[PDB]
Design an enzyme around this catalytic site. Structure first.
Site, PDB file in Angstrom:
ATOM      1  N   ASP B 334       0.839  -1.204   0.000  1.00  0.00           N
ATOM      2  CA  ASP B 334       0.000   0.000   0.000  1.00  0.00           C
ATOM      3  C   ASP B 334       0.874   1.254   0.000  1.00  0.00           C
ATOM      4  O   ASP B 334       1.990   1.236   0.513  1.00  0.00           O
ATOM      5  CB  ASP B 334      -0.907   0.002   1.214  1.00  0.00           C
ATOM      6  CG  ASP B 334      -1.913  -1.134   1.181  1.00  0.00           C
ATOM      7  OD1 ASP B 334      -2.844  -1.089   0.343  1.00  0.00           O
ATOM      8  OD2 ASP B 334      -1.769  -2.082   1.987  1.00  0.00           O
ATOM      9  N   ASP B 686      -4.159  -3.738   6.499  1.00  0.00           N
ATOM     10  CA  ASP B 686      -4.499  -3.183   7.813  1.00  0.00           C
ATOM     11  C   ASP B 686      -5.976  -3.283   8.212  1.00  0.00           C
ATOM     12  O   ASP B 686      -6.285  -3.218   9.418  1.00  0.00           O
ATOM     13  CB  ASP B 686      -3.990  -1.740   7.989  1.00  0.00           C
ATOM     14  CG  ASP B 686      -4.640  -0.755   7.023  1.00  0.00           C
ATOM     15  OD1 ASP B 686      -3.902  -0.010   6.330  1.00  0.00           O
ATOM     16  OD2 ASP B 686      -5.893  -0.719   6.955  1.00  0.00           O
ATOM     17  N   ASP B 690      -8.530  -6.641   4.393  1.00  0.00           N
ATOM     18  CA  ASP B 690      -7.206  -7.102   4.015  1.00  0.00           C
ATOM     19  C   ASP B 690      -6.893  -8.509   4.551  1.00  0.00           C
ATOM     20  O   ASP B 690      -5.933  -9.140   4.094  1.00  0.00           O
ATOM     21  CB  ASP B 690      -6.135  -6.134   4.506  1.00  0.00           C
ATOM     22  CG  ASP B 690      -6.254  -4.730   3.891  1.00  0.00           C
ATOM     23  OD1 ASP B 690      -6.191  -4.585   2.640  1.00  0.00           O
ATOM     24  OD2 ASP B 690      -6.375  -3.760   4.681  1.00  0.00           O
TER      25      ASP B 690
END
Ligand SMILES: OC[C@H]1O[C@H](O[C@H]2[C@H](O)[C@@H](O)[C@@H](O)O[C@@H]2CO)[C@H](O)[C@@H](O)[C@@H]1O
Ligand SMILES: OC[C@H]1O[C@H](O[C@H]2[C@H](O)[C@@H](O)[C@@H](O)O[C@@H]2CO)[C@H](O)[C@@H](O)[C@@H]1O
Ligand SMILES: [K+]
Lengths: 29, 975
Positions: B334, B686, B690
């Site tokens: 990310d 997170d 996910d």
């Protein structure tokens, strides 16, 4: 000195362990 | 409280005597802590106990019994103390190896302190919620759980704050569809867990919502705590390959040991009977050469490695992932928390200036100051300007202040303006404070009062009736406001909208020009969009938000608020106002981190919420792409990705380095497709969403500052959320490996040496080069001092220049098994050659330079034929000390060959591991004691000459360094 300082602690314990072993072979006799 | 599911909330509060708004008092906590214990499974309880473990071995005791039978035969007839000496050495070999194992296991267990189980309580001592160790939670306290949290204890639900509470209980009940909860009693006291719909079980998850509850049971009394009692409790690929090799080595050495008891056939007669001598010599080699049970130094450099990692912010949760870590070939990261700092600042903005047919011009502005401080200027054409002179900026600021759930806060100790809500929103608060569009007095305000002074001036012109929260389909939010207290000319209610440019601009029918309004056209749209692109693609790769107002919003009772999908419709018929451009710089260490990955053959894939165009540009800035590289097949949006056929999607993951704007299900897919090419992928996450991907990934990586659910599904947590942390964790992963291999090489060769040494004596017919107590002596010094020192050697030199290790690779390659034999062969021959040398070409009463020593067996009675010398010089105490000393010194030397797998001592000098050098000096000062302190050489053998004899021990031993250098050369210059 922080993490490297646990190498001295590790070897000293092993040295003492081996040394004590010899001195006991000394005393026996 | 045993049956809380069957009682009222009011009965549960009553039972513990606790206020629901207050929570337990420090006094109550104290008394409850005594009555009910800690919220944990009881610690299961050693120094002496673990020493006896080694003496359970059959082959160890076979030696002892043989030294007892040998002692008893002496007492009814050196040999007298033999059973006493061996016992002392073997307790010492046990102590040294068992003491390392326990400390490694303790240090590795102590990794759990970096990320301890946490809980949220209201207690009487504070009004605010308190985050505490779940351990310290007690039956009766008031607990707050929300999305992403792990339930800390068994809790009776008091009130559900969200519209709905969704819970993942699979870990307890097998159902992996999240479950609805309520608050009423469940009357049946016999009820099963599935039916306890008002209850929250320890170990479970909040998949959505927020709730307050009272703790009913903790520690053992809990549902999962009862299961964990009755519960009774898989080898990694490198553990299988080490165990399997352990048995391949074990059985070869066991055959060669019995082969020593055989070839000495006839010799059972010299001064059924003498077999106790050759049996007690064969068994000692078995105890020294065969490594039974995992060598302790192994677990030590894993322990030292993950300790290092934790200090570099990589918290290992799953130890098997340390093995996988050096095999990773793909990293998916990310962007926001991880590649970039997440320190947001609006540095650019614009509104509409002039509109004339096809012609559209803009008022662009830039803003200085990049922290959250209300400190900096608004510039136009590089000249400081006062925002209020522009009616459009007044409106732009009104939007930023109202489309916002954040504020600033001055932190008086730290002396810094800090963020309250989300970085993105707070960047807007900061902006507003700099614009001060109504020229409010600010210069005399305390820093505390200054933080939100201008935001509140705006906030007092209207009432914020309600918010249409953000949603992924529209990529925009809005608030609905009425004018406060009524102005002069009662202007109607308004809506303010902020969101992604592309989507909001399509929903605009008007544009604001100053305070006037004008129809949205194609030409205006194109001009708006071109600057969005320039700022997205330029040096600062800005994230742009478009800001709009709905001038005539629907009436209130036309709008349903619990239904997120009607929200886009309400945000149509808009008036475009302006655009803000946000900065969020790449972290300083990231360019270098990405280049390391190139060098180590690891592909990096960025995932971002940025639009496609911007996503690529960021990738050029950070080195993922070249500033000129073609990218049209290596960059995709979630939309473009969804339109591809499956085989094409797969092919896209083979080569793609950049995914922008992905649905929540995309990460999983990317994992699957990467696995279909045998990629070893690391994936960050997170959120609760996910979790499935983190599960699939070879290494799931959770953010330190993220949810517990993501952490629970991961192998590793990033303490500082930083991309560089990941790369550094790969660096350690590879280092730990090379450290195992360095110790493995030294262990196998030195044991093989012991075997070749003894076998050569029994095979040729030579007189015993090493007595068993001598062998058990060397075996102890090496494993005790120098061998454990290699557990403390530095990272190997170019571990980030080789590609990733394959998971299918064999632990020991044929070439490496050659380096084991060739080295082991030379030591074994060098020890036996050092004894034989004293007999052959040495000036201390020699044998024959032809070959006579072979037949030493026939002498005492067979004197007149082919001897002409004494026959007790074969029991001499000098050839066995030459053999011992050569073994010991070549062992210290062989340790210098284990400083690096392939680097020469010319590049990695002896003093690289300075502890190894120490333990050598300690090994020598022990050796200069069994040759000089006068009771000991009698129990072993007698000293070597002050000079000339040591020079042979050194010219014999030192070429072991020279040999391994050639073998390292045929590995460095081979590649
Ligand atoms: O809070 C006092 C505030 O009032 C004035 O700003 C007014 C402005 O006069 C009007 O145009 C209206 O729309 O509301 C503004 C904000 O309340 C002062 O100009 C300003 O300095 C002062 O802070
Ligand atoms: O400026 C021309 C435009 O004026 C009025 O539009 C107003 C709007 O109705 C108000 O809600 C205000 O907030 O903004 C606009 C001015 O920018 C007229 O109603 C409209 O028909 C006319 O075109
Ligand atoms: K995983």
């Amino acid at each position: 000195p922080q993490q490297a300082r646990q190498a001295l602690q590790c070897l000293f314990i092993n040295f003492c362990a081996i040394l004590i072993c010899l001195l006991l072979i000394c005393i026996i006799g | 409280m045993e049956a809380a599911h069957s009682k009222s909330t009011e009965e549960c509060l009553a039972y513990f005597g606790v206020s629901e708004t207050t929570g337990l008092t420090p006094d109550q906590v104290k008394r409850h802590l005594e009555k009910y214990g800690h919220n944990e499974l009881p610690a299961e309880e050693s120094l002496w106990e673990l020493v006896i473990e080694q003496f359970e071995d059959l082959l160890v005791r076979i030696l002892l019994l043989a030294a007892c039978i040998s002692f008893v035969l002496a007492w009814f007839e050196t040999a007298f103390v033999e059973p006493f000496v061996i016992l002392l050495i073997l307790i010492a070999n046990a102590i040294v190896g068992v003491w390392q194992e326990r400390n490694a296991e303790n240090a590795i267990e102590a990794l759990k302190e970096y990320e301890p189980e946490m809980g949220k309580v209201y207690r009487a001592d504070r009004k605010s919620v308190q985050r505490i160790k779940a351990r310290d939670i007690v039956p009766g306290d008031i607990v707050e759980v929300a999305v992403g949290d792990k339930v800390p204890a068994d809790i009776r639900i008091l009130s559900i704050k969200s519209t709905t509470l969704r819970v993942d209980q699979s870990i307890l009940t097998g159902e992996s569809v999240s479950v609805i909860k309520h608050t009423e009693p469940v009357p049946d006291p016999r009820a099963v867990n599935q039916d306890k719909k008002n209850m929250l079980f320890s170990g479970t998850n909040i998949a959505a919502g927020k709730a307050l509850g009272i703790v009913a049971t903790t520690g053992v009394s809990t549902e999962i705590g009862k299961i964990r009692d009755q519960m009774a409790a898989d080898k990694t690929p490198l553990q299988q390959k080490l165990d399997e090799f352990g048995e391949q080595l074990s059985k070869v050495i066991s055959l060669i040991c019995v082969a020593v008891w055989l070839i000495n056939i006839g010799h059972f007669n010299d001064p059924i009977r003498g077999a106790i001598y050759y049996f007690k010599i064969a068994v000692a080699l078995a105890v020294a050469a065969i490594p039974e049970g995992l060598p302790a130094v192994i677990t030590t450099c894993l322990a030292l490695g993950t300790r290092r990692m934790a200090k570099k912010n990589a918290i290992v949760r799953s130890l098997p992932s340390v093995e996988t870590l050096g095999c990773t070939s793909v990293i998916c990261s990310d962007k926001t928390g991880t590649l970039t700092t997440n320190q947001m600042s609006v540095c650019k903005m614009f509104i509409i200036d002039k509109v004339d047919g096809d012609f559209c011009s803009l008022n662009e502005f830039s803003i200085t100051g990049s922290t959250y401080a209300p400190e900096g200027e608004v510039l136009k054409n590089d000249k400081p300007i006062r925002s209020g002179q522009f009616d459009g900026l007044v409106e732009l600021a009104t939007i930023c202040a109202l489309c916002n759930d954040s504020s600033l806060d001055f932190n008086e100790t730290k002396g810094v303006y800090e963020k309250v809500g989300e970085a993105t929103e707070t960047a807007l608060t900061t902006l507003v404070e700099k614009m001060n569009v109504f020229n409010t007095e600010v210069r005399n305000l305390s820093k505390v009062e200054r933080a939100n002074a201008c935001n509140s001036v705006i906030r007092q012109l209207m009432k914020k009736e309600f918010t249409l929260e953000f949603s992924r389909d529209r990529k925009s939010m809005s608030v609905y406001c009425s004018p406060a207290k009524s102005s002069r000319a009662a202007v109607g209610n308004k809506m303010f909208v902020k969101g992604a440019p592309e989507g909001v601009i399509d929903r605009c029918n008007y544009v604001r020009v100053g305070t006037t309004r004008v129809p949205m056209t194609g030409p205006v749209k194109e001009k708006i969009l071109s600057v969005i692109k320039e700022w997205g693609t330029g040096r600062d790769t800005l994230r742009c938000l478009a800001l709009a107002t709905r001038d005539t919003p629907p009436k209130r009772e036309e709008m349903v608020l619990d239904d997120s999908s009607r929200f886009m419709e309400y945000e149509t018929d808009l008036t475009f106002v302006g655009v803000v451009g946000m900065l969020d710089p790449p972290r300083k260490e990231v360019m270098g981190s990405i280049q390391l990955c190139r060098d180590a053959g690891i592909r990096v894939i960025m995932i971002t919420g940025d639009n496609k165009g911007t996503a690529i540009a960021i990738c050029r800035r950070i080195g993922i792409f070249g500033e000129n590289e073609e990218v049209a097949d290596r960059a995709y949006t979630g939309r473009e990705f969804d339109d591809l056929p499956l085989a094409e999607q797969r092919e896209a993951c083979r080569r793609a380095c950049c995914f922008a704007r992905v649905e929540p299900s995309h990460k999983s897919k990317i994992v699957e497709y990467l696995q279909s090419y045998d990629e070893i992928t690391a994936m960050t996450g997170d959120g609760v969403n996910d979790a499935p991907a983190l599960k699939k990934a070879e290494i799931g990586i959770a953010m330190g500052s993220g949810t517990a659910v993501a952490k629970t599904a991961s192998e590793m947590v990033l303490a500082d959320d930083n991309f560089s942390t990941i790369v550094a964790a790969v660096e350690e992963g590879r280092a730990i490996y090379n450290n195992m291999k360095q110790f493995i090489r030294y262990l196998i060769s030195s044991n093989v040496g012991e075997v070749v040494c003894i076998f050569l004596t029994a095979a040729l017919g030579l007189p015993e080069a090493l007595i068993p107590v001598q062998l058990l002596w060397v075996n102890l010094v090496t494993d005790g001092l120098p061998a454990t020192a290699l557990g403390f050697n530095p990272p190997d030199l170019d571990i980030m220049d080789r590609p990733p290790r394959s998971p299918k690779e064999p632990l020991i390659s044929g070439w490496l098994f050659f380096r084991y034999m060739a080295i082991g062969g030379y030591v074994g021959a060098a020890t036996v050659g050092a004894a034989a040398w004293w007999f052959m070409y040495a000036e201390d009463g020699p044998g024959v330079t032809y070959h006579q020593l072979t037949h030493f067996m026939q002498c005492t009675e067979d004197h007149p034929h082919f001897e002409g010398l004494d026959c007790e010089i074969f029991e001499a105490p000098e050839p066995m000390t030459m053999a011992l000393s050569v073994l010991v010194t070549i062992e210290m030397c062989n340790a210098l060959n284990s400083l690096s797998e392939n680097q020469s001592l010319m590049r990695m000098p002896p003093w690289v591991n300075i502890w190894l050098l120490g333990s050598i000096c300690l090994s020598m000062s022990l050796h200069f004691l069994i040759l000089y302190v006068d009771p000991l050489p009698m129990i072993f053998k007698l000293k070597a000459l002050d000079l000339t004899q040591w020079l042979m021990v050194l010219k014999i031993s030192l070429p072991v360094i020279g040999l391994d250098e050639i073998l390292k050369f045929i590995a460095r210059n081979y590649l």
